[PDB]
């Protein structure tokens, strides 16, 4: 039974590889055939439309428009708060409006000069600048590009770049894909640098509120 | 007998929260009751007095004045050394003059442009700029404020901000509260980023020196 | 057996100290008597010679000259790729040309504004600027210095500094000493911040390619 004791070892690894491949293909097929509440072009155009005003007025108008076109998918004013985001070596702030297992919409930006690693996840993230500047340094190149209000950067799936923002840079962010892949990145600098677990609690609270809102909307649609 | 299973846990958690509340009340009352070697106004005025001259001359004059007004509570010239401080995503350097379990005084600053998370501890930290600029971004806002020589930033207890310092920014720092709460923060980037454990040794050394000086001064004053 | 058991601990600790000291002395004596493919002056002069041109033209000419003078010790064009480097709180990009256990040559630089801790390892690292600016802040001082194309920074063994690079700063890097000492540093920010394990894989790939090239060259010299 020495040959069969080794047959288990060989076949168990093949089974693990086949199961992981089947799970990845299943998730990819689900993501390709799923119905989405928002599309990235919608958010990008809505942001470019109000990018000419003050970024706070733009925030207000964009939130109003999002609640009008997609009722039941955006948090109310009593649940909106700015939460610090320390990640990839940079530090900014977010205001989450919607978040599911496959989509999230928020208002991002920083009042200080920061920059770092953009992350590399199984999701596509679009960023439309309302004010400020956004320097992107794509992988495998020696030159970066600066983007201004109105522009939209698309951090593609599986791509990793370097991001840099000047003081007062604010944008509207929409992420689509497998959102939990980002989660770990979003927490790294909080665990091994800032030690700001209170901000971690705030982040957990707002994400939980968005997920519960989406679940309650699904239940209301069913009854 | 099944009801007691969950009754053990349910009231026990309230008792645990009450016990930590009693510990917090004891520590909070001890801080107000405690007599303090320094007050933030004293350090702030002493630093602002010399904020108009060169930052090195200001360092020397402030150290001499502190040794004059509080003998036995400030390290001698043989114990002063600049130690790198990597924390919260920023990098500066410190020279510790005094440190107890509830107070610390030091000269902080950086010769490079840095910035990051300010930390969130159970202590109030006052910073009086001797030279340079200090950008502070408070939590929950979208705009930051720049402070110049003469100004004083008060990192309040439990609040977290974003700090940014330009090249050649130097200040006098006084912290009061529960000092060990900051400790972990002060080491995070050293453990998970810089790997400069020699600087960790230097920091532990100066902290131990200050604590031993404070203990010996207490023993000498008591007898 | 109290007297005997305390005897165990003392001799055990002395044995550990003596063994670690003998290992360190062995490695240092080996490093002092080893033949090296490159010297820092060679790389520094070769980079300063082409420091007047564009950093890409300089890269190509320097690679050509290095492959001409030292054939079989530098990877070919099919193995060269730019890999992101997140370390010490800064983010740049590298292109490795040569790497052994005691030497490494690469082209380093960043297209974004970054800076942080320089690291502290058992190796000397020379950096000859082809373009941009390099701000160095030495340990124990309150002033930094800016260096321009043509200059050479020598990150000495055991010294720790603060580095800062402007957008578009590119240089040629040569490191000599005990290379594994740097290893932890090179991965720290990747494990506890970026979570970009694909870039980790790329780094491992290029390091393995350079090491295998060196091993195959030694075998070819032997036969």
Numbering used by the authors:
A (entry chain A), B (entry chain B), C (entry chain C): -3 to 219
From the paper:
The sigma-1 receptor (σ1R) is a non-opioid transmembrane receptor which has been implicated in many diseases, including neurodegenerative disorders and cancer. σ1R responds to a structurally diverse array of synthetic ligands such as (+)-pentazocine (agonist) and haloperidol (antagonist). Here, we present multiple crystal structures, including an open-like conformation, of σ1R from Xenopus laevis. Together with functional binding analysis our data suggest that access to the σ1R ligand binding site is likely achieved by protein conformational changes that involve the carboxy-terminal two-helix bundle, rather than structural changes in the cupin-fold domain.
The xlσ1Ropen-endo structure was solved in the P212121 space group, with each asymmetric unit containing 12 protomers. Each asymmetric unit contains four trimers, which are packed in a tetrahedron shape through the α1–α1 contacts. One region consists of the transmembrane helix α1, which swings ~18° away from the trimer center in xlσ1Ropen-endo compared to xlσ1Rclosed-endo. Like xlσ1Rclosed-endo, the xlσ1Ropen-endo crystals were grown in the absence of any known ligand, but the xlσ1Ropen-endo structure also has an unidentifiable electron density within its ligand-binding pocket.
